[PDB]
Subunit: 138 residues, 3 copies
Protein backbone atom coordinates (compact mmCIF):
# COMPACT_ATOMS: atom_id res chain seq x y z
CA UNK A 1 0.00 0.00 0.00
CA UNK A 2 2.46 2.63 -1.22
CA UNK A 3 1.46 6.32 -1.45
CA UNK A 4 1.95 7.55 -5.01
CA UNK A 5 1.61 10.96 -6.59
CA UNK A 6 0.79 10.92 -10.31
CA UNK A 7 0.77 13.67 -12.91
CA UNK A 8 -1.87 13.07 -15.57
CA UNK A 9 -1.15 12.65 -19.27
CA UNK A 10 -2.83 14.44 -22.17
CA UNK A 11 -2.81 15.30 -25.84
CA UNK A 12 -4.33 18.23 -27.74
CA UNK A 13 -3.78 20.51 -30.77
CA UNK A 14 -2.20 23.96 -30.74
CA UNK A 15 -4.58 26.64 -29.48
CA UNK A 16 -6.66 24.43 -27.22
CA UNK A 17 -6.89 24.32 -23.46
CA UNK A 18 -6.30 21.12 -21.52
CA UNK A 19 -6.98 20.19 -17.91
CA UNK A 20 -4.29 17.99 -16.31
CA UNK A 21 -4.81 16.59 -12.83
CA UNK A 22 -2.13 15.65 -10.34
CA UNK A 23 -3.54 12.80 -8.28
CA UNK A 24 -2.64 10.90 -5.14
CA UNK A 25 -3.15 7.18 -4.64
CA UNK A 26 -3.26 5.35 -1.30
CA UNK A 27 -2.80 8.47 0.81
CA UNK A 28 -2.87 7.75 4.55
CA UNK A 29 -3.75 10.80 6.65
CA UNK A 30 -1.47 13.16 4.74
CA UNK A 31 -1.34 16.57 6.38
CA UNK A 32 0.97 18.58 4.19
CA UNK A 33 2.36 18.34 0.69
CA UNK A 34 4.82 20.56 -1.12
CA UNK A 35 5.82 19.71 -4.64
CA UNK A 36 6.99 21.10 -7.96
CA UNK A 37 5.36 20.20 -11.28
CA UNK A 38 7.57 21.01 -14.24
CA UNK A 39 5.95 21.43 -17.65
CA UNK A 40 7.14 21.72 -21.29
CA UNK A 41 7.61 24.94 -23.30
CA UNK A 42 4.69 23.96 -25.53
CA UNK A 43 2.38 24.48 -22.56
CA UNK A 44 1.32 27.68 -20.83
CA UNK A 45 -0.37 27.77 -17.44
CA UNK A 46 -3.79 29.47 -17.38
CA UNK A 47 -4.99 28.39 -13.93
CA UNK A 48 -4.32 26.03 -11.03
CA UNK A 49 -7.40 24.69 -9.23
CA UNK A 50 -8.00 22.60 -6.10
CA UNK A 51 -8.83 18.96 -6.77
CA UNK A 52 -11.38 16.48 -5.43
CA UNK A 53 -9.47 16.01 -2.18
CA UNK A 54 -8.37 19.56 -1.48
CA UNK A 55 -11.53 21.67 -1.98
CA UNK A 56 -11.29 22.65 1.70
CA UNK A 57 -7.55 22.33 2.28
CA UNK A 58 -5.26 25.34 2.69
CA UNK A 59 -3.97 25.61 -0.89
CA UNK A 60 -1.15 27.71 -2.42
CA UNK A 61 0.61 27.72 -5.77
CA UNK A 62 3.23 29.80 -7.52
CA UNK A 63 4.11 29.63 -11.20
CA UNK A 64 7.72 30.51 -11.95
CA UNK A 65 9.35 29.72 -15.26
CA UNK A 66 8.49 26.19 -16.32
CA UNK A 67 7.48 25.00 -12.87
CA UNK A 68 4.45 25.21 -10.63
CA UNK A 69 5.19 25.11 -6.91
CA UNK A 70 2.21 23.83 -5.00
CA UNK A 71 1.64 23.79 -1.27
CA UNK A 72 -1.21 21.95 0.44
CA UNK A 73 -1.99 21.78 4.15
CA UNK A 74 -4.98 20.03 5.66
CA UNK A 75 -5.47 19.40 9.38
CA UNK A 76 -8.19 16.79 8.61
CA UNK A 77 -5.74 14.58 6.79
CA UNK A 78 -6.05 13.46 3.18
CA UNK A 79 -6.51 9.73 2.58
CA UNK A 80 -7.38 7.41 -0.30
CA UNK A 81 -7.28 8.24 -4.00
CA UNK A 82 -8.24 11.46 -5.77
CA UNK A 83 -6.98 14.67 -7.35
CA UNK A 84 -4.78 17.09 -5.39
CA UNK A 85 -5.11 19.81 -8.02
CA UNK A 86 -5.81 20.42 -11.71
CA UNK A 87 -3.71 22.56 -14.00
CA UNK A 88 -5.42 24.34 -16.87
CA UNK A 89 -2.92 24.63 -19.71
CA UNK A 90 -3.13 26.22 -23.11
CA UNK A 91 -1.31 24.48 -25.92
CA UNK A 92 0.90 27.12 -27.55
CA UNK A 93 3.78 10.57 -38.94
CA UNK A 94 6.46 10.79 -36.21
CA UNK A 95 6.16 13.31 -33.33
CA UNK A 96 7.65 13.83 -29.87
CA UNK A 97 6.32 13.74 -26.31
CA UNK A 98 6.96 16.00 -23.31
CA UNK A 99 7.26 15.29 -19.58
CA UNK A 100 5.07 16.68 -16.85
CA UNK A 101 7.52 16.03 -14.04
CA UNK A 102 6.94 15.87 -10.29
CA UNK A 103 9.88 16.69 -8.05
CA UNK A 104 11.04 18.44 -4.92
CA UNK A 105 8.40 16.51 -2.99
CA UNK A 106 8.01 17.12 0.75
CA UNK A 107 5.17 15.20 2.35
CA UNK A 108 4.15 14.60 5.98
CA UNK A 109 1.21 12.95 7.73
CA UNK A 110 -0.98 14.83 10.20
CA UNK A 111 1.35 13.74 13.04
CA UNK A 112 4.36 15.30 11.34
CA UNK A 113 5.96 12.05 10.18
CA UNK A 114 7.72 11.92 6.79
CA UNK A 115 5.69 9.94 4.27
CA UNK A 116 7.43 7.77 1.69
CA UNK A 117 5.97 8.37 -1.73
CA UNK A 118 6.56 7.10 -5.22
CA UNK A 119 6.04 9.49 -8.12
CA UNK A 120 4.80 8.98 -11.67
CA UNK A 121 5.33 11.71 -14.26
CA UNK A 122 2.83 12.65 -16.94
CA UNK A 123 3.30 12.80 -20.68
CA UNK A 124 1.94 15.42 -23.06
CA UNK A 125 1.76 15.33 -26.86
CA UNK A 126 0.53 17.78 -29.47
CA UNK A 127 -2.09 15.94 -31.51
CA UNK A 128 -4.71 16.59 -34.23
CA UNK A 129 -8.31 15.37 -34.36
CA UNK A 130 -6.89 12.28 -32.66
CA UNK A 131 -9.51 13.18 -30.05
CA UNK A 132 -11.00 9.83 -30.57
CA UNK A 133 -8.87 9.96 -27.44
CA UNK A 134 -11.71 11.69 -25.65
CA UNK A 135 -14.07 9.20 -27.30
CA UNK A 136 -11.98 6.33 -25.89
CA UNK A 137 -11.53 7.67 -22.36
CA UNK A 138 -11.54 4.71 -19.97
CA UNK B 1 -13.95 2.81 6.46
CA UNK B 2 -15.88 5.51 8.32
CA UNK B 3 -16.03 5.55 12.15
CA UNK B 4 -19.65 5.44 13.28
CA UNK B 5 -21.26 5.66 16.69
CA UNK B 6 -24.65 3.94 16.97
CA UNK B 7 -27.29 4.02 19.69
CA UNK B 8 -29.16 0.72 19.92
CA UNK B 9 -32.90 0.33 19.41
CA UNK B 10 -35.36 -1.48 21.68
CA UNK B 11 -38.95 -2.16 22.58
CA UNK B 12 -40.55 -3.24 25.87
CA UNK B 13 -43.73 -2.87 27.98
CA UNK B 14 -44.27 -0.44 30.84
CA UNK B 15 -42.58 -1.57 34.04
CA UNK B 16 -39.76 -3.54 32.46
CA UNK B 17 -36.06 -2.81 32.33
CA UNK B 18 -34.18 -2.66 29.04
CA UNK B 19 -30.48 -2.62 28.24
CA UNK B 20 -29.51 -0.34 25.33
CA UNK B 21 -25.94 -0.31 24.05
CA UNK B 22 -24.17 2.54 22.34
CA UNK B 23 -21.68 0.97 19.94
CA UNK B 24 -18.78 2.08 17.78
CA UNK B 25 -17.99 0.71 14.35
CA UNK B 26 -14.65 0.95 12.55
CA UNK B 27 -12.87 2.78 15.35
CA UNK B 28 -9.21 3.48 14.58
CA UNK B 29 -7.11 4.05 17.70
CA UNK B 30 -9.64 6.33 19.38
CA UNK B 31 -8.26 7.82 22.57
CA UNK B 32 -11.06 9.96 23.90
CA UNK B 33 -14.78 10.28 23.37
CA UNK B 34 -17.26 12.71 24.85
CA UNK B 35 -20.88 12.50 23.84
CA UNK B 36 -24.44 13.11 24.94
CA UNK B 37 -27.19 10.50 24.62
CA UNK B 38 -30.65 12.01 24.85
CA UNK B 39 -33.56 9.76 25.79
CA UNK B 40 -37.39 10.01 25.82
CA UNK B 41 -39.61 10.82 28.83
CA UNK B 42 -40.98 7.27 28.77
CA UNK B 43 -37.55 6.04 29.85
CA UNK B 44 -35.77 6.40 33.17
CA UNK B 45 -32.07 5.73 33.65
CA UNK B 46 -31.22 3.05 36.24
CA UNK B 47 -27.53 2.53 35.45
CA UNK B 48 -24.78 3.23 32.92
CA UNK B 49 -22.21 0.47 32.46
CA UNK B 50 -18.92 0.14 30.55
CA UNK B 51 -19.18 -1.82 27.31
CA UNK B 52 -17.12 -4.53 25.61
CA UNK B 53 -14.44 -2.06 24.54
CA UNK B 54 -14.22 0.14 27.62
CA UNK B 55 -14.00 -2.33 30.55
CA UNK B 56 -10.56 -0.90 31.32
CA UNK B 57 -10.93 2.63 29.95
CA UNK B 58 -11.26 5.69 32.18
CA UNK B 59 -15.06 6.03 32.17
CA UNK B 60 -17.36 8.84 33.42
CA UNK B 61 -21.03 9.61 33.02
CA UNK B 62 -23.49 12.17 34.33
CA UNK B 63 -27.26 11.99 34.01
CA UNK B 64 -28.95 15.39 33.85
CA UNK B 65 -32.52 15.83 32.72
CA UNK B 66 -33.15 13.78 29.60
CA UNK B 67 -29.50 13.40 28.66
CA UNK B 68 -26.58 11.22 29.66
CA UNK B 69 -23.17 12.83 29.27
CA UNK B 70 -20.50 10.21 28.82
CA UNK B 71 -16.76 10.63 28.85
CA UNK B 72 -14.29 7.91 27.85
CA UNK B 73 -10.50 8.10 27.81
CA UNK B 74 -8.20 5.23 26.93
CA UNK B 75 -4.45 5.55 26.37
CA UNK B 76 -4.38 2.11 24.65
CA UNK B 77 -6.65 3.30 21.89
CA UNK B 78 -10.01 1.78 20.99
CA UNK B 79 -10.29 0.15 17.56
CA UNK B 80 -12.74 -2.03 15.65
CA UNK B 81 -16.38 -2.66 16.52
CA UNK B 82 -18.00 -3.10 19.92
CA UNK B 83 -20.00 -1.45 22.68
CA UNK B 84 -18.79 1.76 24.34
CA UNK B 85 -21.37 1.54 27.10
CA UNK B 86 -24.79 0.11 27.98
CA UNK B 87 -27.64 2.07 29.50
CA UNK B 88 -30.07 0.24 31.76
CA UNK B 89 -33.46 1.91 31.40
CA UNK B 90 -36.77 1.29 33.08
CA UNK B 91 -39.86 1.77 30.97
CA UNK B 92 -42.12 4.13 32.91
CA UNK B 93 -53.05 -0.73 16.52
CA UNK B 94 -51.10 2.50 15.91
CA UNK B 95 -48.37 3.67 18.34
CA UNK B 96 -45.42 6.08 18.33
CA UNK B 97 -41.64 5.74 18.52
CA UNK B 98 -39.02 7.73 20.44
CA UNK B 99 -35.46 8.76 19.58
CA UNK B 100 -32.33 7.83 21.46
CA UNK B 101 -30.21 10.63 20.08
CA UNK B 102 -26.43 11.02 19.99
CA UNK B 103 -25.05 14.54 19.89
CA UNK B 104 -22.40 16.90 21.17
CA UNK B 105 -19.77 14.42 20.01
CA UNK B 106 -16.09 15.19 20.61
CA UNK B 107 -13.73 12.43 19.53
CA UNK B 108 -9.93 12.25 19.15
CA UNK B 109 -7.42 9.52 18.35
CA UNK B 110 -4.57 8.65 20.70
CA UNK B 111 -2.36 11.23 18.93
CA UNK B 112 -4.85 14.02 19.63
CA UNK B 113 -6.21 14.29 16.08
CA UNK B 114 -9.92 15.01 15.55
CA UNK B 115 -11.75 11.95 14.29
CA UNK B 116 -14.58 12.29 11.78
CA UNK B 117 -17.54 10.23 12.85
CA UNK B 118 -21.00 9.52 11.56
CA UNK B 119 -23.79 8.96 14.07
CA UNK B 120 -26.88 6.76 14.02
CA UNK B 121 -29.65 7.34 16.55
CA UNK B 122 -31.65 4.61 18.23
CA UNK B 123 -35.40 4.12 18.33
CA UNK B 124 -37.47 2.99 21.29
CA UNK B 125 -41.10 1.82 21.35
CA UNK B 126 -43.43 0.70 24.11
CA UNK B 127 -44.64 -2.77 23.14
CA UNK B 128 -46.65 -5.71 24.56
CA UNK B 129 -45.80 -9.42 24.41
CA UNK B 130 -44.37 -8.52 21.01
CA UNK B 131 -41.23 -10.03 22.55
CA UNK B 132 -41.19 -12.47 19.76
CA UNK B 133 -38.70 -9.67 19.21
CA UNK B 134 -36.34 -11.36 21.62
CA UNK B 135 -37.22 -14.65 19.94
CA UNK B 136 -36.24 -13.15 16.56
CA UNK B 137 -33.02 -11.46 17.63
CA UNK B 138 -30.56 -11.68 14.73
CA UNK C 1 -4.32 -7.66 12.92
CA UNK C 2 -2.16 -8.22 16.01
CA UNK C 3 1.57 -7.36 15.99
CA UNK C 4 3.58 -10.46 16.87
CA UNK C 5 7.28 -11.01 17.46
CA UNK C 6 8.49 -14.55 16.75
CA UNK C 7 11.78 -16.28 17.50
CA UNK C 8 12.64 -18.87 14.86
CA UNK C 9 13.11 -22.57 15.55
CA UNK C 10 16.01 -24.77 14.45
CA UNK C 11 17.83 -28.05 14.78
CA UNK C 12 21.46 -28.99 14.12
CA UNK C 13 24.29 -31.28 15.31
CA UNK C 14 27.07 -30.37 17.72
CA UNK C 15 29.80 -28.30 16.08
CA UNK C 16 27.65 -26.65 13.44
CA UNK C 17 26.55 -23.05 13.10
CA UNK C 18 22.88 -22.12 12.80
CA UNK C 19 21.18 -18.88 11.82
CA UNK C 20 18.01 -18.09 13.80
CA UNK C 21 15.87 -15.11 12.86
CA UNK C 22 13.62 -13.12 15.14
CA UNK C 23 10.76 -11.87 13.00
CA UNK C 24 7.88 -9.43 13.30
CA UNK C 25 4.44 -9.96 11.84
CA UNK C 26 1.83 -7.26 11.18
CA UNK C 27 4.00 -4.39 12.37
CA UNK C 28 2.30 -1.00 12.03
CA UNK C 29 4.75 1.90 11.90
CA UNK C 30 6.90 0.62 14.76
CA UNK C 31 9.56 3.14 15.72
CA UNK C 32 11.46 1.48 18.52
CA UNK C 33 11.87 -2.01 19.89
CA UNK C 34 13.81 -3.25 22.88
CA UNK C 35 13.76 -6.91 23.72
CA UNK C 36 15.69 -9.76 25.29
CA UNK C 37 16.20 -13.12 23.57
CA UNK C 38 17.23 -15.84 25.99
CA UNK C 39 18.98 -18.91 24.62
CA UNK C 40 19.97 -22.38 25.93
CA UNK C 41 23.40 -23.44 27.26
CA UNK C 42 23.86 -25.71 24.25
CA UNK C 43 24.10 -22.60 22.07
CA UNK C 44 26.83 -20.00 21.83
CA UNK C 45 26.39 -16.64 20.14
CA UNK C 46 28.82 -15.94 17.26
CA UNK C 47 27.15 -12.87 15.74
CA UNK C 48 23.97 -10.78 15.71
CA UNK C 49 23.01 -9.28 12.34
CA UNK C 50 20.35 -6.83 11.15
CA UNK C 51 17.38 -8.44 9.42
CA UNK C 52 15.35 -7.73 6.29
CA UNK C 53 13.51 -4.83 7.93
CA UNK C 54 16.33 -3.23 9.90
CA UNK C 55 19.22 -2.96 7.39
CA UNK C 56 19.03 0.82 7.78
CA UNK C 57 17.62 1.12 11.30
CA UNK C 58 19.71 2.23 14.28
CA UNK C 59 20.64 -1.19 15.68
CA UNK C 60 22.30 -2.22 18.98
CA UNK C 61 22.81 -5.51 20.77
CA UNK C 62 24.56 -6.73 23.87
CA UNK C 63 25.22 -10.36 24.78
CA UNK C 64 25.33 -11.01 28.51
CA UNK C 65 25.12 -14.48 29.97
CA UNK C 66 22.37 -16.44 28.26
CA UNK C 67 20.55 -13.41 26.89
CA UNK C 68 20.88 -11.06 23.95
CA UNK C 69 19.56 -7.55 24.55
CA UNK C 70 18.59 -5.93 21.30
CA UNK C 71 17.64 -2.34 20.64
CA UNK C 72 16.19 -1.07 17.37
CA UNK C 73 15.18 2.48 16.48
CA UNK C 74 13.89 3.59 13.10
CA UNK C 75 12.38 7.00 12.37
CA UNK C 76 10.88 5.67 9.10
CA UNK C 77 8.72 3.19 10.95
CA UNK C 78 8.78 -0.57 10.45
CA UNK C 79 5.62 -2.16 9.06
CA UNK C 80 4.49 -5.53 7.70
CA UNK C 81 6.28 -8.85 8.10
CA UNK C 82 10.01 -9.60 8.05
CA UNK C 83 13.10 -10.28 10.13
CA UNK C 84 14.23 -7.84 12.82
CA UNK C 85 17.57 -9.59 13.27
CA UNK C 86 19.35 -12.92 12.84
CA UNK C 87 21.45 -14.63 15.48
CA UNK C 88 24.33 -16.80 14.36
CA UNK C 89 24.76 -19.57 16.92
CA UNK C 90 27.26 -22.37 17.21
CA UNK C 91 25.97 -25.64 18.60
CA UNK C 92 28.31 -26.58 21.44
CA UNK C 93 15.47 -42.25 20.28
CA UNK C 94 14.23 -39.71 22.85
CA UNK C 95 15.83 -36.23 23.14
CA UNK C 96 14.96 -32.83 24.62
CA UNK C 97 14.21 -29.38 23.22
CA UNK C 98 15.29 -25.91 24.34
CA UNK C 99 13.51 -22.54 24.35
CA UNK C 100 14.59 -19.42 22.53
CA UNK C 101 12.57 -17.04 24.66
CA UNK C 102 11.52 -13.45 23.96
CA UNK C 103 10.89 -11.22 26.95
CA UNK C 104 11.34 -7.78 28.44
CA UNK C 105 9.68 -6.34 25.35
CA UNK C 106 9.29 -2.56 25.04
CA UNK C 107 7.79 -1.42 21.76
CA UNK C 108 6.46 1.94 20.53
CA UNK C 109 5.19 3.30 17.22
CA UNK C 110 6.79 6.30 15.52
CA UNK C 111 4.39 8.61 17.42
CA UNK C 112 5.55 7.26 20.78
CA UNK C 113 2.46 5.16 21.51
CA UNK C 114 2.85 1.80 23.26
CA UNK C 115 2.24 -1.07 20.87
CA UNK C 116 0.51 -4.24 22.06
CA UNK C 117 2.41 -7.28 20.89
CA UNK C 118 2.07 -11.01 21.21
CA UNK C 119 5.22 -13.11 21.40
CA UNK C 120 6.07 -16.59 20.16
CA UNK C 121 9.19 -18.34 21.43
CA UNK C 122 11.45 -20.52 19.33
CA UNK C 123 12.52 -24.10 19.92
CA UNK C 124 15.96 -25.58 19.34
CA UNK C 125 16.99 -29.24 19.23
CA UNK C 126 20.31 -31.01 18.75
CA UNK C 127 19.84 -33.34 15.79
CA UNK C 128 21.87 -35.65 13.49
CA UNK C 129 21.69 -35.93 9.70
CA UNK C 130 17.99 -35.24 10.25
CA UNK C 131 18.76 -32.35 7.87
CA UNK C 132 16.17 -33.72 5.59
CA UNK C 133 14.87 -30.77 7.60
CA UNK C 134 16.69 -28.44 5.25
CA UNK C 135 15.45 -30.60 2.38
CA UNK C 136 11.86 -30.15 3.63
CA UNK C 137 12.00 -26.42 4.32
CA UNK C 138 8.58 -24.94 3.49
CL1 LIG D 1 4.00 27.70 -2.95
CL1 LIG E 1 9.30 14.58 3.24
CL1 LIG F 1 -19.17 13.46 31.98
CL1 LIG G 1 -13.89 16.31 17.74
CL1 LIG H 1 21.14 -2.98 23.96
CL1 LIG I 1 5.91 -0.95 25.57
MG1 LIG J 1 1.59 12.02 17.11
Amino acid sequence: AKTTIIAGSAEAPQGSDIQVPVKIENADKVGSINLILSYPNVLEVEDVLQGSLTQNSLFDYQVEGNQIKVGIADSNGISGDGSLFYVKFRVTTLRNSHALTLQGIEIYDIDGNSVKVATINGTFRIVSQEEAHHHHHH
